[PDB]
Amino acid sequence: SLTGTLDAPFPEYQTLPADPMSVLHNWLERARRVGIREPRALALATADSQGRPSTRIVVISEISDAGVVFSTHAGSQKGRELLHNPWASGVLYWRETSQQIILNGQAVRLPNAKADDAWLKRPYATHPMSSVSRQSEELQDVQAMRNAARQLAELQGPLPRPEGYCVFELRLESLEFWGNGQERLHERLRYDRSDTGWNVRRLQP
Template sequence: MPGDFHAVDDPFPVIEAWLEEARATEINDPNAMALATVDEHGMPDVRIVLMNGFDRRGLVFYTNVGSAKGAQLDQQPKAAAVFHWKSLRRQIRVRGPVERVTDAEADAYYATRPRLSRIGAWASRQSQPLASRAALEEAVATREAEFAGGEPPRPDWWTGFRIIPISIEFWLDQPFRLHDRAVFRRETPADAWVRTRLYP
């Protein structure tokens, strides 16, 4: 059974099975994950992002590279992420190094976004001070006029990051807080996974 993390030596099918179930049951953003990075002072920083790509290479999300998380990942390319599906009583934790996706991958995903979201990528100076909501709306209107004759291309400062897992932990809620947990670890992405059952 792909969703049984104690019965497999590879965590990726379990992630896919749990994501598929979340897509069928979660009302909003089943692909939402808390993303933790480290800033220039060594302080952790966390926020919710959407995972918009998943395969055996890792988990992908997209952002403005000038944002806080983009700058932090460029300085220290490592991250941790958590999926928590409360209604399913499940959680997945992921840790690992981070790399940028290729331009081709970023272009392909950018092209699937709604037009106004693509305009927004041009208009927003993500994480920078904003004088007012009106200033943002003006920037959007300016970019809409600029691209009125065609499709907005992907900005150079907007791309994806891939977390390459070296640790994946599954958590399943059980009565009386006697939860079911297991962690898969590997030293490098080229190594085989080692599964360990954990106390709750």
């Protein structure tokens, strides 16, 4: 099913760099240079108190020292799940280069001053709907929501940050970099955090 047609170098599969955050930064920078479409669209999995997963796309806003950062609403399914079970996993998949990056760890809600900054960095045209919507609750009246947001759209932004608008940091415990390789020997480079740094392994395809 693969369709990749842009160059996809994976020298790290040979050299086994010690720091997977450096690999992550370099893969993302390469993705930006070669023009991958929506490279930061992360399929993010959380799980409820029974261990049942749920998934959705979120956008990675930043790569931090400990992992990756995204924004969402605290009262959404993902926010409620993360509040009780911080473990999460996300995958980036770039069709053009046949590459995946899998990111596993614990996601921690950051303080309100970080949320305030993230909110002000969103285009102000986003503020009305984000203010009126209680993400993932049932929507009883579509027109009423549309009209309330239109009222707020008439203002000069920015609007106040809504209470539940929050930023999570996914602090990584493991990562995998996947490339298509040659001869169906797909190339899998797996990192796991240790007490003192990171361990690295190749995995069978």
